[PDB]
Design an enzyme around this catalytic site. Structure first.
Site, PDB file in Angstrom:
ATOM      1  N   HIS A  41       0.807  -1.207   0.000  1.00  0.00           N
ATOM      2  CA  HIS A  41       0.000   0.000   0.000  1.00  0.00           C
ATOM      3  C   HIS A  41       0.840   1.257   0.000  1.00  0.00           C
ATOM      4  O   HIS A  41       0.268   2.350  -0.039  1.00  0.00           O
ATOM      5  CB  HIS A  41      -0.997   0.008   1.169  1.00  0.00           C
ATOM      6  CG  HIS A  41      -0.388   0.218   2.523  1.00  0.00           C
ATOM      7  ND1 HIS A  41      -0.090  -0.826   3.374  1.00  0.00           N
ATOM      8  CD2 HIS A  41      -0.078   1.352   3.198  1.00  0.00           C
ATOM      9  CE1 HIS A  41       0.395  -0.344   4.505  1.00  0.00           C
ATOM     10  NE2 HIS A  41       0.415   0.974   4.424  1.00  0.00           N
ATOM     11  N   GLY A 143       2.924   5.604  10.106  1.00  0.00           N
ATOM     12  CA  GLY A 143       4.302   5.465   9.700  1.00  0.00           C
ATOM     13  C   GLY A 143       4.973   4.180  10.130  1.00  0.00           C
ATOM     14  O   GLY A 143       6.137   3.971   9.784  1.00  0.00           O
ATOM     15  N   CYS A 145       4.079   0.997   9.371  1.00  0.00           N
ATOM     16  CA  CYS A 145       4.002  -0.115   8.438  1.00  0.00           C
ATOM     17  C   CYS A 145       5.375  -0.476   7.893  1.00  0.00           C
ATOM     18  O   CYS A 145       6.259   0.371   7.755  1.00  0.00           O
ATOM     19  CB  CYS A 145       3.040   0.214   7.312  1.00  0.00           C
ATOM     20  SG  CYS A 145       1.370   0.105   7.915  1.00  0.00           S
TER      21      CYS A 145
HETATM   22  C1  LIG Z   1      -4.166   0.846   3.110  1.00  0.00           C
HETATM   23  C2  LIG Z   1      -4.213   0.351   4.558  1.00  0.00           C
HETATM   24  C3  LIG Z   1      -3.794  -1.131   4.649  1.00  0.00           C
HETATM   25  C4  LIG Z   1      -3.344   1.233   5.471  1.00  0.00           C
HETATM   26  C5  LIG Z   1      -3.645   1.017   6.973  1.00  0.00           C
HETATM   27  N1  LIG Z   1      -4.983   1.427   7.247  1.00  0.00           N
HETATM   28  C6  LIG Z   1      -5.555   1.171   8.579  1.00  0.00           C
HETATM   29  O1  LIG Z   1      -4.893   0.621   9.458  1.00  0.00           O
HETATM   30  C7  LIG Z   1      -7.010   1.642   8.859  1.00  0.00           C
HETATM   31  C8  LIG Z   1      -7.459   1.190  10.004  1.00  0.00           C
HETATM   32  C9  LIG Z   1      -8.941   1.678  10.313  1.00  0.00           C
HETATM   33  C10 LIG Z   1      -9.367   1.804  11.667  1.00  0.00           C
HETATM   34  C11 LIG Z   1     -10.647   2.234  11.938  1.00  0.00           C
HETATM   35  C12 LIG Z   1     -11.495   2.537  10.889  1.00  0.00           C
HETATM   36  C13 LIG Z   1     -11.073   2.420   9.562  1.00  0.00           C
HETATM   37  C14 LIG Z   1      -9.776   1.985   9.282  1.00  0.00           C
HETATM   38  C15 LIG Z   1      -2.661   1.891   7.784  1.00  0.00           C
HETATM   39  O2  LIG Z   1      -2.932   3.025   8.086  1.00  0.00           O
HETATM   40  N2  LIG Z   1      -1.348   1.298   8.172  1.00  0.00           N
HETATM   41  C16 LIG Z   1      -0.367   2.070   8.928  1.00  0.00           C
HETATM   42  C17 LIG Z   1       0.972   1.782   8.288  1.00  0.00           C
HETATM   43  O3  LIG Z   1       1.598   2.650   7.850  1.00  0.00           O
HETATM   44  C18 LIG Z   1      -0.332   1.602  10.370  1.00  0.00           C
HETATM   45  C19 LIG Z   1      -1.559   2.124  11.259  1.00  0.00           C
HETATM   46  C20 LIG Z   1      -1.539   3.423  11.379  1.00  0.00           C
HETATM   47  C21 LIG Z   1      -2.120   3.706  12.819  1.00  0.00           C
HETATM   48  N3  LIG Z   1      -1.693   2.468  13.642  1.00  0.00           N
HETATM   49  C22 LIG Z   1      -1.361   1.514  12.740  1.00  0.00           C
HETATM   50  O4  LIG Z   1      -0.970   0.395  12.974  1.00  0.00           O
END
Ligand SMILES: CC(C)C[C@H](NC(=O)/C=C/c1ccccc1)C(=O)N[C@H](C=O)C[C@@H]1CCNC1=O
Length: 306
Positions: A41, A143, A145
């Site tokens: 992603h 940040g 991921c």
């Molecule tokens: C395109 C997708 C897979 C990205 C991923 N998205 C999500 O984790 C969205 C989670 C969410 C929670 C509640 C309602 C709707 C969605 C992300 O942000 N991944 C982040 C990686 O950069 C890590 C997140 C950020 C906050 N804490 C974490 O672990």
């Protein structure tokens, strides 16, 4: 003496974290030999993240759509491909700090160390258990991921986890190092619920054995139990059923303490039925399920405090 949730020393992994940028999105990559692994992603904009088609998004990128930064050194991408939910970036340089490593897919209930990283720079280390519902109770911000979970055997790093997302309940989900998710989750900016979770009975038992190894016997009793009768109590208290394989796995810790597995199961059944009566076990007021039998043998003395 003592007993702590203990991570593996993170140095061998720190030397493999890099930063990967594509467009405006930046996250962490894992740089081993001449390949950088990272979550796919990274190629998504805010528009894309809700319903991305990664095959379509990716073919629109070249090698120079990807900026890879290793400390101060910029690394030149010379190839790319998609493996499940990961991107494999081939770079012009082989990481000289690459350790001996494997990629493994852990099983639910097993533990691993997480090296939380931001902008390719390591930030913290902690120990996690893969829950039965395939989540981990991590600590992750925007940040994070691309951070990895790993175990270390002698001097071989077994990577087993890459971080992709956070669920609505605050727990985390991710993939093995082939990009295949643990649990039924997908990398899309949408709320997805964890399945219901269970206590890891095998780990609770290994930890009661740790308490006895470290010299504490207050919770034992005179009774014993059958596997089936134990499994009636476990189901009332939302514990995983105990199997004959799990009994077998506890063989060595049973031997070292002289406490038969089903005797310890009778102890745990009594702890479940009566509580702990304001007492602690290895310093905890609750029953701990994030130590495997392997974790216990690794950390405790091989000599019981008799
Ligand atoms: C395109 C997708 C897979 C990205 C991923 N998205 C999500 O984790 C969205 C989670 C969410 C929670 C509640 C309602 C709707 C969605 C992300 O942000 N991944 C982040 C990686 O950069 C890590 C997140 C950020 C906050 N804490 C974490 O672990």
């Amino acid at each position: 003496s003592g007993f702590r949730k203990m991570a593996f020393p993170s140095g061998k992994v720190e030397g493999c974290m890099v930063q990967v940028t594509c467009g405006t999105t930046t996250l962490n990559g894992l740089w081993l030999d001449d390949t950088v692994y990272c979550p796919r992603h990274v190629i998504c904009t805010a528009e894309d993240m809700l319903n991305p088609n990664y095959e379509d998004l990716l073919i629109r990128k070249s090698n120079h759509s990807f900026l890879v930064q290793a400390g101060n050194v910029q690394l030149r991408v010379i190839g790319h491909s998609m493996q499940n939910c990961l991107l494999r970036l081939k770079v012009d340089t082989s990481n000289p700090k690459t350790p001996k490593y494997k990629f493994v897919r852990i099983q639910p209930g097993q533990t691993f160390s997480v090296l939380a990283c931001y902008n390719g720079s390591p930030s913290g280390v902690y120990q996690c258990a893969m829950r039965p519902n395939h989540t981990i109770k991590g600590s992750f911000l925007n940040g994070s991921c691309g951070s990895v979970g790993f175990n270390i055997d002698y001097d071989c790093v077994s990577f087993c986890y890459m971080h992709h997302m956070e669920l609505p309940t605050g727990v985390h989900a991710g993939t093995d190092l082939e990009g295949k998710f643990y649990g039924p989750f997908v990398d899309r900016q949408t709320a997805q619920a964890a399945g219901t979770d269970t206590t890891i009975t095998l780990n609770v038992l290994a930890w009661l054995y740790a308490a006895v190894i470290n010299g504490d016997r207050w919770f034992l009793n005179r009774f014993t139990t059958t596997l089936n009768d134990f499994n009636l109590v476990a189901m009332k208290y939302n514990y995983e059923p105990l199997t004959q394989d799990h009994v077998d796995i506890l063989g060595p810790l049973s031997a070292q303490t002289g406490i038969a597995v089903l005797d310890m199961c009778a102890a745990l059944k009594e702890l479940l039925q009566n509580g702990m009566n304001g007492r602690t076990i290895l310093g905890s007021t609750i029953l701990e399920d994030e130590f495997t039998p392997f974790d216990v043998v690794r950390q405790c003395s091989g000599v019981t405090f008799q």
